[PDB]
Amino acid sequence: MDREAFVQTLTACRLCPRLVAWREEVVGRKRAFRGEPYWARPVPGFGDPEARILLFGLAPGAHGSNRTGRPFTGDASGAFLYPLLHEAGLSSKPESLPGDDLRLYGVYLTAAVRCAPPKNKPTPEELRACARWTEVELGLLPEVRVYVALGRIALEALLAHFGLRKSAHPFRHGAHYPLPGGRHLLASYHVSRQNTQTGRLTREMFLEVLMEAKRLAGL
Numbered sequence: 384m385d386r387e388a389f390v391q392t393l394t395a396c397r398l399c400p401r402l403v404a405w406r407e408e409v410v411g412r413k414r415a416f417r418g419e420p421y422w423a424r425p426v427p428g429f430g431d432p433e434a435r436i437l438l439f440g441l442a443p444g445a446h447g448s449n450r451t452g453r454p455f456t457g458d459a460s461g462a463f464l465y466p467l468l469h470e471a472g473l474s475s476k477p478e479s480l481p482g483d484d485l486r487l488y489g490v491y492l493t494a495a496v497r498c499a500p501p502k503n504k505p506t507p508e509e510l511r512a513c514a515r516w517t518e519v520e521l522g523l524l525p526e527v528r529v530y531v532a533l534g535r536i537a538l539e540a541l542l543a544h545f546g547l548r549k550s551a552h553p554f555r556h557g558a559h560y561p562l563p564g565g566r567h568l569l570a571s572y573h574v575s576r577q578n579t580q581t582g583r584l585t586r587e588m589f590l591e592v593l594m595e596a597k598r599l600a601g602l
């Protein structure tokens with residue numbers, strides 16, 4: 384199927400009972416955004432349809448992409464990620480807001496799970512379920528040369544997708560695994576608030592990951 388079909392069928396998905404309920408249940412839960420329109424549905428990837436770099440997150444934030452409808456947009460993750468994408472020379476502007484004219488240069492953003500999970504922690508069953516969408520979504524991006532896993536779970540999802548052993552591709556910030564055909568898998572700490580607020584993942588550290596992705600992608 385093409386992108387239009389992918390988005391239409393993905394957004395209708397109701398496979399995970401806990402997530403179908405939660406993505407809607409959280410609407411209005413945060414008073415700060417109560418009254419605001421909520422996507423409250425599976426989140427389609429965002430970016431260059433001819434991307435050479437793919438950033439792979441874990442799952443939507445209840446009041447982030449589950450609210451705005453665009454990956455990482457609306458919460459702490461996007462506040463950290465989007466400005467760095469711009470500094471790395473991979474986007475048109477530092478901020479990401481639904482309905483804006485933001486464009487990514489050869490980069491596409493998505494995640495292993497596409498519906499907001501409680502505690503931002505999907506279950507193995509939910510991860511196994513959404514893998515069907517990872518197959519469809521990555522199938523629409525044949526030009527990708529570098530896959531950047533944001534966190535251990537995202538890395539494991541990519542390893543499963545490519546039939547790679549967890550043992551031989553351990554998770555650590557800065558890990559780099561070459562794949563057949565000049566492709567590359569890069570691992571980074573997730574850009575969640577926990578890692579960024581504590582300093583575990585610094586802005587310079589993430590910019591370094593993006594610069595490496597650019598180099599490896601021939602950008």
Ligand SMILES: O=c1ccn([C@H]2C[C@H](O)[C@@H](COP(=O)(O)O)O2)c(=O)[nH]1
Pocket residue numbers: 429430431432483484485486487488489
């Ligand atoms: O090179 C490209 C082309 C389109 N996109 C995405 C960005 C927007 O969501 C739409 C196009 O938005 P617009 O600014 O209206 O041309 O598709 C991108 O990220 N990079």
Ligand code: SF4
Pocket residue numbers: 393396397398399402403425496497498509512513514516
């Ligand atoms: S997480 Fe994925 S598989 Fe589960 S309901 Fe959402 S879109 Fe469907």
